[PDB]
Design a protein around this ligand. Structure first.
Ligand SMILES: [Ca+2]
Ligand SMILES: [Ca+2]
Ligand SMILES: [Ca+2]
Ligand SMILES: [Ca+2]
Lengths: 145, 17
């Protein structure tokens, strides 16, 4: 994995590790999941953290986050788990995630984005070139190696 | 950060077993 792939995965870690203390707690994952219109119970939040927390101290540190991100063979979701993921982004239900919907989602994650940064984000998953992310395009970003 | 990394993080973190 490239050194900039690491930096990118560091940037994602920053989204979860709200208080920047170098660990993600069940509390912080809670607040991320709620900021995306989701609603996990406390025990759900403990299941998620355990399946990454390799060393069993209750939290995710960056070395454990890097390992999650880096390492997974192919096997992947039901089109049901993907749909619910797609629907966090497709705020108005129309079938297309636009630049404005992504920007809104980022803001909720405490992320201070510029239009050009948003547009380049649309660019990585936009495949037909329409400036938006349909679901078929969403799948591929979620579902490929 | 990268839609890629965000989605992957969210997808991989949600797996509860
Ligand atoms: Ca933290
Ligand atoms: Ca740990
Ligand atoms: Ca939309
Ligand atoms: Ca498109």
């Amino acid at each position: 994995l490239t050194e900039e792939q690491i930096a990118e995965f560091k940037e994602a870690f920053s989204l979860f590790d709200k208080d920047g203390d170098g660990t993600i707690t069940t509390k912080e994952l809670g607040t991320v999941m709620r900021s995306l219109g989701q609603n996990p119970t406390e025990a759900e939040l403990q299941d998620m953290i355990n399946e990454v927390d390799a060393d069993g101290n209750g939290t995710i540190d960056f070395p454990e986050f890097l390992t999650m991100m880096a390492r997974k063979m192919k096997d992947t979701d039901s089109e049901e788990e993907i749909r619910e993921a797609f629907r966090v982004f497709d705020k108005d239900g129309n079938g297309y995630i636009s630049a404005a919907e992504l920007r809104h989602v980022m803001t909720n994650l405490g992320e201070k984005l510029t239009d050009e940064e948003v547009d380049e984000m649309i660019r990585e998953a936009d495949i037909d070139g329409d400036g938006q992310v349909n679901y078929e395009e969403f799948v591929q970003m979620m579902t490929a190696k | 950060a990268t839609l890629d990394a965000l989605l992957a993080a969210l997808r991989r973190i949600q797996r509860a077993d």
